[PDB]
Symmetry: D2
């Protein structure tokens, strides 16, 4: 890689509000960027215990750790050392909407992610405010190039306590801070699991596997 | 299969309007339902030549022909001989919206699809009314069970003449006419290509490969 | 008016499907186009009794009968004798979507409206399929000019049996068949009431008052 | 009013990001709450000069100053001294989305508004990032009660330099911190004008007239 080692670490500084409730989070992560393997530990440093499902924040806590085949240009890795930013819109089926923005920078062997999260209109008796969600189903992000940016769309779904799903549509725009070689139409399959946490989720550990690929049936 | 042979044929009767323009279509198709392989020939029997891109109609012309692994229940095949119906909403990025409804019945070795298509708000100088589209990128439909129905979401994209993409979000609801064994969270990867057509697309031939699968990274 | 008399009549021919259920409707209407007063009688000539709330069809049954102040150009009236068409998208809060297209022509003292209605994804246990709706709250359509077309947006709401509202967002695009003088940013306030009907709504009578105006607080 | 004087003042503390760009704003306002008349002066205290149109922030800078007829219960005024909060979603026609949350408190004769603004996906060559907008057309918010909250929908539009409009749909949810008497289906007409500002809009003065009313044609 030259700029990105086979083994990297990263820090996460997140801030934001959910239905008006302010909060702050810090995380320490590590993983093999070229293997698409990752793990991170979060701490609600302010505003905890959170009155909403942690699952809505788990996806906001690292694109550089995506396994890209050699024949598919890696938009995000190419952006360093300059780095990139991403902007995300999350539309939940019960009307809740979230806007999230990240700034990813690099320093030596450590990535630094600054995140601003804004979510609202989560129904008081809904899955999020009642904490009835149980993790995200594995997902598949559809990605393509446009205006020098990489745009990703994903039909996410949170498993519900008692069965059923709580749908959320994701739209993420990755913006490199310098022009890079754009990839073709492809996908990134992911698995995001909370592997550990304390009773009130003021402490959480997450694992994620991200692998890019070309259309299965082409 | 018992009800669905290894080799089947099917007839398509489509009717509808696009920005007020009425039209009728008839098709003769054939394929191997258990192999997910298909081919169909369409004829614009009324209202032709069509003043809009044929690509918006190609996806409306056959779920029974989807290759499902044995460990994933095939919602659509299970529905026969009773059959099923599907309702679809297509949201294009330039504001155009389409609502499509199908009724799939079976008689011996032949499937019969009756289709009603309603599309409007296609900008006069847009890709559809100017016929600047060049086929659909291969897609991946996210499917899950709910209320006894199978619901599918797909981020489709039409290739544009001169480069670039014209996005369309698909939402399809499959309704069996009798209760069947519901599948888990899965996907269906597809490839839909117009393999032949005359000058004004009043005649068209399409090929499609549909394969179901479980999450890649799980 | 010269082309539009002070008292006019009109015929309505509607066809369409709701969750796959086909139907046909015919109506005889009359009103004072310059006073914005209207009344029409509908008959479900085919596919009745309808298994869904009639309220979703009441708004599809006459823009020429809108009272426009003299200082606000009347886009629709100006279009005659050539006439115009309108395309409408209806988004209900429970996910149901409808696409509607009309063609308005004139012959002497009578207007003729041909309508195609396509609605689907109405939840089986929802307000529409269970017939729990009780009319539309009076509405206010926001209108402005663009590309020679008049575009209207309206936040509609159906009153529910037992209290509460069932929201629906309307987007209507009016397309004159000949260039006309475009109006500025304005609104059209309406009142649409079912004044009579038989037991299964296979027969219905509707009254409507439509008045254009400039912003109240400007 | 007892709690709200005929003449009041208020302070505004806003913070947020637009396409990743952080900023802070402070304002001093005054007005006659029962007359629906208002005026406020803003200062970009941090992150200026802003690289985006100020118009997107003008609507985030005071519901208490709305003239409500006596026969229509004033949800917001009733909430004091406890106060209320509002959550807003802004959907622009070019894809940009904003989520805004406010907290309105009262102390004597002064209202205090704390605001968090999150906006993103504003196209770099769009009206907002290029500063081609010229104020909001007067608007009309559709309001109704639900779950003890007041919900408002508004079809907003920004005038564009060179003619034309840039559409934005508003959805605002007002949440009183204590139960109050809920109003019926009604509207609030508004006029929001930037009456003064310096060259780079790091200083701005805004005027607003807000009047509630029942449906015009009922």
């Amino acid at each position: 890689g030259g700029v990105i080692a086979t083994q990297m670490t990263y820090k996460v500084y997140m801030s934001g509000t959910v239905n008006g409730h302010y909060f702050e989070v810090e995380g320490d992560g590590k993983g093999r960027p070229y293997e698409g393997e990752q793990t991170v530990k979060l701490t609600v440093t302010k505003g905890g215990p959170l009155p909403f499902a942690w699952d809505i924040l788990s996806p906001q806590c690292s694109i550089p750790f995506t396994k890209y085949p050699e024949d598919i240009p890696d938009y995000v890795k190419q952006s360093f050392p300059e780095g990139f930013t991403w902007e995300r819109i999350m539309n939940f089926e019960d009307g809740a909407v979230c806007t999230v923005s990240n700034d990813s920078s690099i320093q030596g062997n450590c990535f630094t992610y600054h995140v601003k999260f804004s979510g609202l209109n989560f129904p008081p008796n809904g899955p999020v405010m009642q904490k009835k969600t149980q993790g995200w189903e594995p997902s598949s992000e559809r990605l393509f190039a446009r205006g020098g940016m990489l745009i990703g769309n994903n039909f996410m779904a949170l498993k519900l306590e008692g069965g059923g799903h709580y749908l959320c549509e994701f739209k993420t725009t990755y913006k490199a801070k310098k022009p890079v070689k754009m990839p073709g139409y492809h996908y990134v399959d992911r698995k995001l699991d909370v592997t550990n946490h304390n009773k009130d989720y003021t402490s959480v550990e997450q694992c994620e596997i991200s692998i890019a690929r070309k259309p299965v049936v082409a």
